[PDB]
Structure formats: structure tokens, C-alpha cells
Amino acid sequence: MNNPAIKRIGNHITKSPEDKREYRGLELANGIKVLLISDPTTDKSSAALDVHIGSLSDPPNIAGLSHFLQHMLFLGTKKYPKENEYSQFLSEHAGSSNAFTSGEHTNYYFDVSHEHLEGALDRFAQFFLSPLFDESAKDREVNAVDSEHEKNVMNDAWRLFQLEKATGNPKHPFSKFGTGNKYTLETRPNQEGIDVRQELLKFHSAYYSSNLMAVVVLGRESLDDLTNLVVKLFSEVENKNVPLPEFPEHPFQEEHLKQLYKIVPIKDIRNLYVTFPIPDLQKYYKSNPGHYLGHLIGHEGPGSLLSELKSKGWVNTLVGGQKEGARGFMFFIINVDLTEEGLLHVEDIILHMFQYIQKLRAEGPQEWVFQELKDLNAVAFRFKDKERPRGYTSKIAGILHYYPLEEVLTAEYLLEEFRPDLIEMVLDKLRPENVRVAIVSKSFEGKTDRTEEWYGTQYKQEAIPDEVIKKWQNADLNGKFKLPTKNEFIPTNFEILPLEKEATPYPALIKDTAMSKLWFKQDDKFFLPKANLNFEFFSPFAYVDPLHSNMAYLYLELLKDSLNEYAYAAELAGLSYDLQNTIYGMYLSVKGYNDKQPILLKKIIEKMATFEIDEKRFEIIKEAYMRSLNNFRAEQPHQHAMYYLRLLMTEVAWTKDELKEALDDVTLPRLKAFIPQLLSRLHIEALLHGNITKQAALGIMQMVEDTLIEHAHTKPLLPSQLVRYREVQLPDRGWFVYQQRNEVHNNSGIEIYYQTDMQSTSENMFLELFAQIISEPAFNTLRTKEQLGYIVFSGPRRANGIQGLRFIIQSEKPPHYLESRVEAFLITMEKSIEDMTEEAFQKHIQALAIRRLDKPKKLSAESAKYWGEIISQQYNFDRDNTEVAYLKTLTKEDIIKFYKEMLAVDAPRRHKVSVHVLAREMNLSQAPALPQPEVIQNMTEFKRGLPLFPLVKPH
Ligand SMILES: COC(=O)[C@H](Cc1cnc[nH]1)NC(=O)CN(CCCc1ccccc1)CC(=O)O
Numbered sequence: 001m002n003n004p005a006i007k008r009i010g011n012h013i014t015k016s017p018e019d020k021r022e023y024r025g026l027e028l029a030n031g032i033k034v035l036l037i038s039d040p041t042t043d044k045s046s047a048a049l050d051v052h053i054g055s056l057s058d059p060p061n062i063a064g065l066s067h068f069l070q071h072m073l074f075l076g077t078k079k080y081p082k083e084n085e086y087s088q089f090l091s092e093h094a095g096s097s098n099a100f101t102s103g104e105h106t107n108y109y110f111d112v113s114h115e116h117l118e119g120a121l122d123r124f125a126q127f128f129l130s131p132l133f134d135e136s137a138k139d140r141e142v143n144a145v146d147s148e149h150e151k152n153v154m155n156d157a158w159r160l161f162q163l164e165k166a167t168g169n170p171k172h173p174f175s176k177f178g179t180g181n182k183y184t185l186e187t188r189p190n191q192e193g194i195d196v197r198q199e200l201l202k203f204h205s206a207y208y209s210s211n212l213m214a215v216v217v218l219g220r221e222s223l224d225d226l227t228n229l230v231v232k233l234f235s236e237v238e239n240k241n242v243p244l245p246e247f248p249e250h251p252f253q254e255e256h257l258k259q260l261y262k263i264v265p266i267k268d269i270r271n272l273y274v275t276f277p278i279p280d281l282q283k284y285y286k287s288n289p290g291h292y293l294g295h296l297i298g299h300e301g302p303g304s305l306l307s308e309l310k311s312k313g314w315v316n317t318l319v320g321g322q323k324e325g326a327r328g329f330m331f332f333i334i335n336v337d338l339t340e341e342g343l344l345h346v347e348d349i350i351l352h353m354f355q356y357i358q359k360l361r362a363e364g365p366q367e368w369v370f371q372e373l374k375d376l377n378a379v380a381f382r383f384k385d386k387e388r389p390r391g392y393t394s395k396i397a398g399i400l401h402y403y404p405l406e407e408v409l410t411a412e413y414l415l416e417e418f419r420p421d422l423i424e425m426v427l428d429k430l431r432p433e434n435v436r437v438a439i440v441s442k443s444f445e446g447k448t449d450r451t452e453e454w455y456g457t458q459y460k461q462e463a464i465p466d467e468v469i470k471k472w473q474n475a476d477l478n479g480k481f482k483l484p485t486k487n488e489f490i491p492t493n494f495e496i497l498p499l500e501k502e503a504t505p506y507p508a509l510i511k512d513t514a515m516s517k518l519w520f521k522q523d524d525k526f527f528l529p530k531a532n533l534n535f536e537f538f539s540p541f542a543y544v545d546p547l548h549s550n551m552a553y554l555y556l557e558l559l560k561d562s563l564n565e566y567a568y569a570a571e572l573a574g575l576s577y578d579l580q581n582t583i584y585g586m587y588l589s590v591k592g593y594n595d596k597q598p599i600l601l602k603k604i605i606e607k608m609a610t611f612e613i614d615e616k617r618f619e620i621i622k623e624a625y626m627r628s629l630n631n632f633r634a635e636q637p638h639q640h641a642m643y644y645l646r647l648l649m650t651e652v653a654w655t656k657d658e659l660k661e662a663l664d665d666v667t668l669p670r671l672k673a674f675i676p677q678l679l680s681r682l683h684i685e686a687l688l689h690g691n692i693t694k695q696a697a698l699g700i701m702q703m704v705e706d707t708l709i710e711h712a713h714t715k716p717l718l719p720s721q722l723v724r725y726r727e728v729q730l731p732d733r734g735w736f737v738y739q740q741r742n743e744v745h746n747n748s749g750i751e752i753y754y755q756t757d758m759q760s761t762s763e764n765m766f767l768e769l770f771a772q773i774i775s776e777p778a779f780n781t782l783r784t785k786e787q788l789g790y791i792v793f794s795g796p797r798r799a800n801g802i803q804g805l806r807f808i809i810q811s812e813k814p815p816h817y818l819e820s821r822v823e824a825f826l827i828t829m830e831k832s833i834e835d836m837t838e839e840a841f842q843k844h845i846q847a848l849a850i851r852r853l854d855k856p857k858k859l860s861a862e863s864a865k866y867w868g869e870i871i872s873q874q875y876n877f878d879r880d881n882t883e884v885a886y887l888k889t890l891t892k893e894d895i896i897k898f899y900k901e902m903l904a905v906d907a908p909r910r911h912k913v914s915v916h917v918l919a920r921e922m923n924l925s926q927a928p929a930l931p932q933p934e935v936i937q938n939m940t941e942f943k944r945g946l947p948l949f950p951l952v953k954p955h
């Protein structure tokens with residue numbers, strides 16, 4: 001009978017009957033709520049802690065302190081004081097880890113090889129026991145946070161996110177600045193005599209209290225074993241009985257309602273944000289009146305708000321529903337993007353909104369809708385895919401805070417109560433008398449008179465004219481607006497087909513004709529009534545030239561726009577498709593309950609092959625596409641770096657500027673012509689994978705072919721015109737640099753590529769092992785020590801059959817300098833591989849092996865792996881055992897000599913390309929001295945003047 005350390009252990013966690021995992025919920029004596037998960041099949045174990053404090057509890061005079069504290073627990077505790085003990089332990093044991101801070105939560109998660117849960121968890125527990133907050137770490141780390149913020153400065157979501165806070169009640173914690181930067185966490189604290197290390201110590205001690213913590217742990221250990229484990233490591237987290245913060249008063253009071261904000265964006269975008277304050281609905285989780293109204297106002301089917309708004313050519317996409325706030329307040333929003341016509345009809349757009357809200361009011365609550373929503377969720381739950389442990393633990397850790405233990409798994413899914421009163425009550429708040437309207441549009445350049453402090457956002461504020469409100473308050477009924485009708489796409493066949501006699505472990509090539517290559521595998525693994533049906537359509541006309549590339553794109557976009565109304569049912573019913581053009585021709589994937597899949601597929605291909613373009617729709621989509629082309633000049637420096645490198649190293653690739661130019665010559669006549677052309681010769685390669693039989697799959701494939709032949713007279717592509725593109729072949733010992741300026745962002749970016757060779761069993765493992773070995777040392781050096789920026793990445797680069805090592809960094813320092821430090825770092829690595837024990841070397845092999853061998857948890861994960869073998873024409877489905885068997889063979893001498901051949905600064909076959917992206921305005925290890933780079937003036941000339949690699953041979 002009773003353990004002193006456990007307050008209780010009832011009862012029985014409700015899981016899906018499909019869910020093979022075992023679960024124990026429990027509460028420690030110190031008040032920590034805890035879920036244990038035993039899965040004796042798992043390859044990685046995982047754990048997570050969530051503390052119910054976050055940025056909303058920041059001291060007013062030190063903004064971002066809790067985000068900063070989160071950064072700091074990683075950098076040393078009393079029991080494991082090495083600045084990077086934690087993260088290195090993880091790396092050498094196939095783990096990874098992150099954290100985040102919302103306004104009420106700080107959330108910490110890791111995964112490790114199943115065999116080392118305990119070692120991981122023990123280091124992990126110390127974050128919550130005796131963090132060091134080293135003076136020297138704090139000094140460095142504040143920069144990583146300053147970077148985390150700069151990254152966000154010029155991004156439109158983050159600016160709008162803060163603007164909202166800065167326009168509500170300034171006295172309210174909602175208005176606080178979450179991220180924090182260097183100014184708020186080092187400069188102004190010094191100016192005001194604060195010792196931040198103390199302030200972190202004070203804050204950790206004040207709020208990281210056990211009564212405010214929830215833990216989840218997933219491992220192969222029995223439930224009893226996990227219990228002992230958790231109790232051991234966590235019983236000594238101290239209970240300081242902290243009252244859990246509430247915010248009963250809304251940040252939007254009367255003076256904050258009936259306001260119009262006109263806002264200048266960074267990207268050339270136009271949207272309208274409509275938003276009403278609502279009470280906190282969390283406690284209504286079993287009826288969920290917010291979701292009901294969301295499902296409705298947000299509907300995109302026939303008769304919906306969105307589809308009238310879009311027929312009138314005013315908006316294109318809509319999102320509506322309940323938005324989080326914190327304990328005590330929430331929002332209900334309706335946000336749309338805007339056409340040019342739309343921008344001019346904002347007053348009208350909102351009337352339409354209120355006419356629809358009025359309709360809902362007119363019909364009253366609807367139990368049949370509730371019933372649909374509830375059934376949909378029952379089914380979602382019953383067959384939810386197995387989640388990756390890290391996500392799972394992190395997520396549940398969050399919600400242990402809201403639901404009884406027994407309910408944690410089901411609470412966010414199952415609906416129980418039908419609540420016409422709550423439905424009605426929330427609806428009563430969606431009124432013009434407490435509306436907020438915000439317009440984001442470049443047309444406010446200069447017309448602005450305010451500036452948001454933290455992001456610099458410029459905008460104007462205004463009371464909506466008393467007599468615009470009145471006009472909205474009288475919103476009539478409007479007969480273009482109907483409730484949605486029954487969802488016909490809801491599945492009702494869930495039968496798992498039995499496993500065939502000749503069924504196989506990997507996909508089989510079951511059809512090899514000139515028209516198509518069908519790869520097929522019945523699911524032997526997850527047994528859910530779902531499937532994935534993937535297709536590459538090859539046509540050389542998709543990417544023959546910039547003009548065509550645009551056409552391929554627009555066609556597909558107008559097609560998706562056209563099916564949208566009908567497709568949406570299917571999406572709600574757990575059946576979705578994804579359709580986009582590639583450099584190779586087109587891609588189509590259909591995932592979800594297999595029951596009604598063949599209906600949706602058929603509808604897609606048919607529409608595709610008999611497509612009839614609305615002209616108004618074309619003109620709007622095109623104008624939007626133009627903007628998204630420009631809008632690249634506002635993506636981030638490192639994305640630019642990455643993007644130029646892709647352009648520089650692929651045989652064929654059209655630039656954003658080329659596409660922009662060629663976009664003007666795209667006319668209705670021209671597109672109409674293009675489509676039948678595209679569809680007239682194709683090849684199809686497909687993976688059909690899931691709850692389906694060989695006969696079913698063969699049929700599905702042929703139905704696709706048949707529909708095309710029938711409506712597009714499609715016929716086969718010639719084997720020889722199955723063009724796959726090559727990577728540029730860099731000379732032995734060369735170094736080229738390409739330079740560009742980012743105009744928006746005041747940071748710089750850099751990608752450095754050391755190209756090694758073709759992919760091959762041996763060549764792959766040489767690069768992979770080296771990547772694993774440097775993986776954390778790189779992060780720990782270039783970011784944690786050197787603090788070059790927030791974004792510091794290294795790893796293998798694999799494109800068009802060739803490979804290499806890359807570094808990507810976004811910094812404040814110039815690329816000339818970034819370059820220098822990577823090279824410095826690179827020598828440190830030859831050194832430390834020389835110095836490391838055979839056993840340290842073997843651990844790395846074992847860590848790679850484990851990452852490589854980790855088994856898929858869900859159908860779409862397994863599909864992805866195969867689809868990679870297929871899209872890359874390597875067709876090596878057994879690559880993981882092969883490549884791993886070979887890895888174990890490798891010795892230290894092999895890696896030293898691999899590095900010396902291909903990577904060292906004076907490597908006989910070093911092949912280096914750097915992309916330098918300059919910012920809007922432009923004691924340490926020893927950097928080696930570098931050659932004069934060759935500066936690339938012209939991308940085409942560069943490509944013309946080098947060899948191209950071969951392409952890989954298949955299995
Ligand atoms: C259940 O209700 C729905 O289906 C709607 C409506 C909709 C989706 N697509 C067409 N309409 N879908 C929603 O996602 C509504 N809403 C999203 C607001 C969160 C948010 C967060 C950050 C920045 C902006 C906004 C809640 C949700 O996730 O379900």
C-alpha cells in the first residue's frame with residue numbers, strides 16, 4: 001500500500017483501441033502531474049516537462065526573461081556542469097531536444113536511443129533542480145536570443161502578432177514583449193543596476209515550482225519501471241505552492257473595440273483581420289461551442305461565407321474560429337486575404353460576414369452538425385496515426401495542465417455535450433459593437449502615423465464611424481448563404497483487408513508499361529483503414545522554359561481553386577490531396593481513409609483533363625502569383641543563400657526574376673493551349689501504399705490512365721525523354737563564391753558546400769559519419785561559444801545524385817568572417833577525431849545506426865521513405881540495412897583519410913562553393929589562411945564552363 005512520493009495513481013487512461021501502447025497517469029506528492037508511456041517496440045525514448053509559467057509572467061521591467069531562462073537551462077546544472085553535457089549526451093546517443101515558451105508555458109522535450117532513457121532523463125531533470133546560469137554563458141547566450149528576435153523582426157506574422165498586443169490595454173500583461181532581445185535582457189538591465197543572473201535565479205526559484213509542472217515519459221521500460229524512474233528523478237523538485245496565474249479581464253476593453261487599424265506590411269500582401277473578444281471557452285471542452293462556430297463561419301463548401309466572398313472576387317482564402325488567449329480570455333476571428341477589388345470593398349466584406357453570422361442566429365444551433373463534428377472526431381481518434389515520441393510527450397505535457405489524467409488522450413478529440421446555450425452565448429458576442437478591424441496593405445505607405453515599438457510596424461488607428469457600425473448591426477439575411485449539407489465523404493468502411501499470400505516487405509514493381517510504373521505495397525505494419533496514393537506525372541513541357549513553368553503552376557493553382565468547394569468536405573472527412581508542379585512535370589498525392597479515396601482521385605484527374613478556366617479567377621490568381629514572386633525579396637538571408645545555391649548547382653533552373661518577367665506573356669488563350677499540350681504525352685510513376693490490394697491498386701492506376709486517355713488523348717513518353725537533371729561538377733581544389741544582397745533583412749546569410757562525390761554505399765556513409773561526429777560540435781562552437789547567430793546548421797547535402805557537407809548560418813557578422821570561422825572549426829574537428837577514443841568513435845557509429853534504423857511509426861512516414869527511393873530513381877528499398885551494415889565496418893583511419901582527401905583546407909579534391917548573402921546595410925581557435933576564391937559573375941557562365949556529373953545507377 002501507499003508510497004509517500006505519489007499523491008495518487010488512478011485511474012485508467014482512455015486510449016484508442018488501436019493504440020498498442022500502455023499508459024499510467026499519476027500525481028507526485030509535490031504536485032507534478034505525470035503520464036507514463038510504455039511502448040516496448042520503440043526505438044527512441046522520450047520525455048517532456050511543461051511548466052505552467054511563460055512570458056505573460058515576465059517582470060515588467062525585464063521583457064523576455066522567461067524565454068531567456070528557457071535558453072539557459074540547457075547550459076549547465078550543478079550535478080552536470082559541462083556547458084554542453086546535455087546536448088552532447090543526446091548527440092552521442094541519437095537524441096535531439098528543444099524547448100519553447102508561450103505566454104503561459106515553458107515546454108522542454110528530448111528524445112534519445114531507447115537504451116539510454118535514464119541517462120538522458122537524469123541530465124534533463126537537473127534543469128528543474130539546480131541550473132548554473134553561468135555568468136559567461138549568460139553573456140554569450142543573450143546573443144542567440146537577440147538573433148532569435150532579428151529573424152522575426154521583418155516577418156509579417158510576428159509583427160502582426162505583437163501589434164495586436166500593443167493596441168489592447170497597455171496596462172495588461174497581454175501587451176508584453178515575449179521574445180525579448182539584447183537591449184531588454186542585457187543593455188537596459190545594466191543601465192538599471194539589475195544583475196540578470198540573480199533575476200534568473202529569482203525567477204526560476206519563484207516559479208519553476210512542482211505544483212505547476214507536468215511530465216510525460218515514453219520508453220520501452222514497464223509502467224512500474226517508469227514509475228520508479230520518474231519518482232527517483234522528480235520527487236525532489238520543490239513545491240513552492242504557486243498560485244497559477246489568471247487573467248479574468250480581457251485586454252480588449254470598450255476603448256479597444258470598434259477600432260480600425262491600417263497597417264503597412266513588409267511583403268506585398270493584402271489582408272483583413274476581423275477579431276472579436278470572447279470569454280475563455282477552455283472549460284467547455286466537452287461541447288466546444290467555439291469549434292462549432294469555427295466549423296461553420298470557416299466552412300468553404302457550397303453556400304459558405306467564403307464562397308460568396310470569392311464569387312464576388314473579393315477574397316481568396318478565409319480562416320475563422322476560436323483563437324487562444326490565456327486563462328481568462330480568448331478571441332474569435334475571421335481573417336481573409338483580399339483581391340485588389342477586395343481591398344476597396346472592406347466595408348462590404350464585413351457586412352457579408354455579419355449577414356452570415358446573422359443567418360447562424362436565424363437558424364439556431366444544429367444538433368446534426370454537432371453530430372457530424374463528434375463522429376468525425378470519434379473516427380479521427382480511433383485511427384489516429386502513431387505520433388513520433390518527441391511530439392507526443394511534448395504535446396501531452398502541455399495538456400496534462402487542462403484535463404483529468406484519465407482524459408488526456410481523448411480530451412481534445414471526443415465531444416460529449418450538445419450545448420445550444422453556449423453556442424448561442426458565443427454567437428451573441430460576434431456583434432459589430434465589439435468588432436476590431438485591421439487592414440494590412442502597401443497602399444498605406446505614408447498614410448501611417450504610428451509605429452509599434454518592438455518591430456517598428458507602422459500603422460494608423462481610427463474609430464469606425466458610428467454609422468458604419470449601424471449599417472453592420474442591421475445586417476439583413478442574404479440568400480447566397482446556406483448551412484452546409486450532410487458530409488457525404490465521411491467514411492464508413494473501416495475494414496482492414498487481410499494480408500495477401502504474395503504480399504511483400506518493400507514495394508513491388510507490379511506494372512512496367514510505357515505509360516506507367518506502378519510500385520505497390522499492402523500495409524503489413526499499421527493496420528489502419530488508410531492509404532497513400534502518390535503519382536509523378538512526367539512532362540518535359542512543365543519546365544521547358546520560364547513561360548511554361550508559370551503555366552504549369554497557374555493551371556494547377558486554378559484547378560485546386562476550382563475543386564476547393566468540393567474537396568473541402570473530403571478534407572474534413574480525413575481525406576486530402578496535395579497537387580503541385582515540379583521541374584519534372586506534376587505531383588499528386590491523395591492520403592487518408594481509403595474508403596472514399598477512389599472517388600476523390602477520379603474527381604481530381606477528370607477535372608484536370610477537362611479543365612475549364614474561369615477568366616476572373618485566372619486574372620486574380622495571376623496577380624497573386626506575381627506578388628508571391630516579388631515577395632521572395634523579403635524571405636530570409638539564409639533562405640536566399642540556400643536558394644542561390646540550388647540555382648547554381650542544378651543543370652537546369654529558372655530564376656524567380658526569369659519567372660516574373662515571363663509572367664506577363666501568360667494570357668488566357670496561351671494557358672488554354674498549354675494544358676492539352678502538357679497532358680498529351682506523359683509517364684506516370686506511382687507508389688500505392690496502405691490498406692489496399694494488388695488488384696485494387698492496379699485498378700486505381702489504370703483508372704487514372706483511362707481517365708486521361710479518354711479526356712486528354714494522352715499517350716506515353718519515350719524512355720529517352722525521361723530527363724533527370726545533373727549537378728554541376730566542381731574542379732579539384734576550386735573555390736567559387738557567389739555574392740548577393742538581401743534588401744529587406746539586416747542580417748546576412750551563408751551556405752558553404754564541400755561537394756564530395758556521387759552517392760554510393762561507401763561514399764554515403766563516409767559523409768554521414770563525419771556529419772554525425774561534427775553535428776553538435778558545430779552547433780556548440782559556431783553558436784553556443786562563438787555566437788555567430790541563431791541559425792547554425794550543418795549536415796549532409798544530397799541533390800540530383802551527388803552529395804556533400806554544408807554549413808548554413810545567418811549572422812550579423814559578414815560572410816567573409818563566417819567563412820573564416822567554419823574553416824577554423826573544421827580543423828578543430830580533424831584534431832578531435834585524432835584525439836577521440838575508439839569507443840567514442842564507435843558510439844557515434846551506434847548513434848548514426850540508430851537514427852538510420854528508426855522504424856516509421858505511421859503509414860505516411862514509411863511511404864515517404866520509399867517515395868524518396870523512387871523520386872530519386874535509386875530504388876534502394878533496403879538501403880538502411882545495407883548502409884548500416886557497411887557503417888559498422890568503418891574505422892577512425894577511414895574518416896581521417898576521407899577528411900584529408902575531400903574536406904581539409906589543402907585537400908587534394910576539396911570542392912568548395914560558397915553563397916554569401918549580404919545584409920541590407922553592408923578568445924578563439926585559429927582560422928586557416930584561404931585561397932583567392934573565383935567570384936561568380938554570371939550563373940549560366942559558371943554552369944556552361946564546368947562538367948556535369950553522371951546520374952546514379954538503380955537497384
Ligand atoms: C474548427 O474550425 C475551423 O475549421 C477553422 C476554419 C477554416 C479552416 N480553413 C478554412 N476555414 N480553422 C481554424 O484553424 C481556425 N482557428 C485558427 C486560428 C489560430 C491562429 C493562430 C495564429 C495566427 C492566426 C490564427 C483555430 C484552429 O486551429 O482550429
Ligand SMILES: [Zn+2]
Nearest residue numbers: 067070071148
Ligand atoms: Zn528561444
